[PDB]
Amino acid sequence: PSTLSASVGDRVTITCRNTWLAWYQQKPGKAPNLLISKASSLPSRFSGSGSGTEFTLTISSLQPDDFATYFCQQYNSYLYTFGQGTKVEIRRTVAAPSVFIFPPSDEQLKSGTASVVCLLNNFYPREAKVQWKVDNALQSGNSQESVTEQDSKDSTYSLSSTLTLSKADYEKHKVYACEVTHQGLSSPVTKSFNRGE
C-alpha cells in the first residue's frame, strides 16, 4: 500500500489505476466500508466526479477520522479486481527517536538463545534505518523489525529491531551495537554494551 502524508483540512485526489465500479475506505484492524458506487450514490465530502478521463476519488477536506487506506474496485469479464490502496497518514513536525538497548536476560541465556533488543521510540517520519555491529562486523539476515501503526494521540511511530543468535555464537563475541539514522538526527545514534558488563 502506497503512502500519502497529509494535514487535517487538505483536499486529496486519488486516481484509480469504463471498468470502474466503486471506492472503499479501510481503517486498521477493521473491514472495508463502501464510499461511492456506479449507482451514483455519494451530499458528502467524498465524490467520484473529478473528470471524464480517469476515475478518481476526491476528499474535499480531510477530517480527523479520514486517516485510513482507500482503494477502488474494477471489473474485467465478470471478475472483480481491487486496485492497490493509498494509505493516508497524518503529517506532523519531525521528531527524532529516543534509542534504548536491552542485552539478553540471563533467563533467556539459560535456554540456549540470545536476543538483543533495540528500541526506537516516538519518531516522525516513519522512515528510519537500524544496523547491527557485532565486534565491529556489520550484520545482515539475523535480525527482525516491527513498527507500530501511527499513534492516535501524538502521530509518531515506534520500532523494535531484534538481533537473534545462538547462545554459543553470542558468547564468542564482546561488543553489541545498533546504529540509528533518521531525519531528526544530525549525526547517527549508536547504543552499545559489552557482554557480561
Binding site: 449507482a39 479486481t81 492497490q84 536476560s105 533467563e107 536476543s115 533488543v117 516491527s146 554494551f193
Partner: protein, 226 residues
C-alpha cells in the same frame, strides 16, 4: 440492524480443508448476492467468488476454480464457503459481503460486510509463549526516562494480549505487531517508558494471555546494574 455475522478463527494444517459461515440479519437474504474476499497479512484484497441468495448460482475466480465451493441455506439466511487443499499462502482474513440486489451498469457495491474470519495455515503445533524480562538499566535510560518491557517469544498461533500492572499502566505502552519466524513460531516485545526516579520503589509486571494454549503469565521486570 442490517448485518452479516461470520464464524470464529480457524487453525489448519497444509493439505486440509476449511469451512466458513456467514449469517444475514435485518434484510431479505433471497433478494441479494454474496461475495467472498480475502486479505493476506500486510496485503491488498483478493476477490474469491460470488453466489446468488435467490438462484444459488455461482461465479468463481479462475485462480481458485476447482478448489473453492460456495453454498447457501435460504431457510436460515446463511452463506457458506469451503476452501480445499490448503497451503501456507492461504493464511488470511476471509470476508463475506452483500453484493447487489437481484444491468451491471448501476452497480450498488459491496455495502454490508462481515467482521472477518482469520484462517492460519501452518505445519506448526500450538505453543504458549516464553516470557523474558527486558530490564531497565543504564543502556535503556537517558535523563529522567527509563525504558523497560517483556519479550513474548516463540508462540503459535496468533494472537497474544499484553497489559501492564493489571491495566493500571497504559500511558507510554507500545505492544509491537508479531513477526513470523523461520521456525513457524511468532515473536513480539511490549515496552513502556517510565520516570527513571521511580525504579527503586515502583513495581512493573507484564500480564501475558495466550488463549489458544491456555497460557497466562505475570512477569515482574526488575532493574539491572550495567
Amino acid at each position: 440492524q442490517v448485518q452479516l455475522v461470520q464464524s470464529g478463527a480457524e487453525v489448519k494444517k497444509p493439505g486440509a480443508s476449511v469451512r466458513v459461515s456467514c449469517k444475514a440479519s435485518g434484510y431479505t437474504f433471497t433478494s441479494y448476492g454474496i461475495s467472498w474476499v480475502r486479505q493476506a497479512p500486510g496485503q491488498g484484497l483478493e476477490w474469491m467468488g460470488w453466489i446468488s441468495g435467490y438462484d444459488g448460482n455461482t461465479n468463481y475466480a479462475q485462480k481458485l476454480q476447482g478448489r473453492v465451493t460456495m453454498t447457501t441455506d435460504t431457510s436460515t439466511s446463511t452463506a457458506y464457503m469451503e476452501l480445499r487443499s490448503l497451503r501456507s499462502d492461504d493464511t488470511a482474513v476471509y470476508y463475506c459481503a452483500r453484493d447487489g440486489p437481484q444491468q451491471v451498469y448501476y452497480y450498488y457495491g459491496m455495502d454490508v460486510w462481515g467482521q472477518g474470519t482469520t484462517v492460519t495455515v501452518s505445519s506448526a503445533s500450538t505453543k504458549g509463549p516464553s516470557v523474558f524480562p527486558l530490564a531497565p538499566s543504564s543502556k535503556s535510560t537517558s535523563g529522567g526516562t527509563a525504558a523497560l518491557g517483556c519479550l513474548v517469544k516463540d508462540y503459535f498461533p496468533e494472537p497474544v494480549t499484553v497489559s501492564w500492572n493489571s491495566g493500571a499502566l497504559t500511558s507510554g505502552v507500545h505492544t509491537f505487531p508479531a513477526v513470523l519466524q523461520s521456525s513457524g513460531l511468532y515473536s513480539l516485545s511490549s515496552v513502556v517508558t517510565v520516570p527513571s526516579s521511580s525504579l527503586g520503589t515502583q513495581t512493573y509486571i507484564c500480564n501475558v494471555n495466550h488463549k489458544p494454549s491456555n497460557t497466562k503469565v505475570d512477569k515482574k521486570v526488575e532493574p539491572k546494574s550495567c
